[PDB]
C-alpha cells in the first residue's frame, strides 16, 4: 500500500507548495492593490485643498 500512497504524498507536497505559491501570489497582488488603492488618494486632498482655496 506504500506504492499507492507514495505518489499521493508526492503530489500532496507539490499541492502544499502550490498553496504557498498561491498565498505568495495573493501577497504579491496585495502590494499592487495597495498601491492602486493608494494612488487615488492624492486627488481628494488636492480637490479638498482647492475647495478651501476657492472658499478663501
Amino acid at each position: 500500500s506504500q506504492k499507492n500512497g507514495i505518489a499521493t504524498l508526492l503530489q500532496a507536497e507539490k499541492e502544499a507548495h502550490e498553496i504557498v505559491s498561491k498565498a505568495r501570489k495573493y501577497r504579491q497582488d496585495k502590494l499592487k492593490q495597495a498601491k492602486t488603492d493608494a494612488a487615488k488618494e492624492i486627488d481628494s486632498y488636492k480637490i479638498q485643498k482647492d475647495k478651501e482655496l476657492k472658499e478663501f
Binding site: G5, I6, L10, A12, E13, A16
Partner: peptide, 10 residues
C-alpha cells in the same frame, strides 16, 4: 515501514 522519497516532506 513505508517507502518515500526526498520530495514529500518539508
Amino acid at each position: 515501514f513505508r517507502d518515500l522519497n526526498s520530495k514529500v516532506r518539508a
